[PDB]
Amino acid sequence: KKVCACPKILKPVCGSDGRTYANSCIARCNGVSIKSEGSCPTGI
């Protein structure tokens, strides 16, 4: 129940914790910034 709503577009990001979230809005809602655009490589 809010006037704001996050986007539903398929544009995921790697957060500075090294997790991937579905978009920039959901990433910021955890209290953390985006390290880069796109999903990140699990091999590093």
**β-strand pairing of 20-21 with 13-15:** antiparallel
Domain that holds residue 43: 1-44
Instruction: Please spell the DSSP secondary structure of the chain, one letter per residue.
Output: --S-----SS--EEETTS-EESSHHHHHHTT--EEEESPPPTT-
Cα(6)–Cα(21) distance, integer angstroms: 12
CATH of the domain at 3: 3.30.60.30
Say if CB 11 and CB 20 are below 8 A apart: no
Method: NMR
Look at the chain and report how many structural domains it folds into: 1
Name the residue among 43, 36, 31 with its Cα closest to residue 20. 36
Cα(13)–Cα(29) distance, integer angstroms: 13
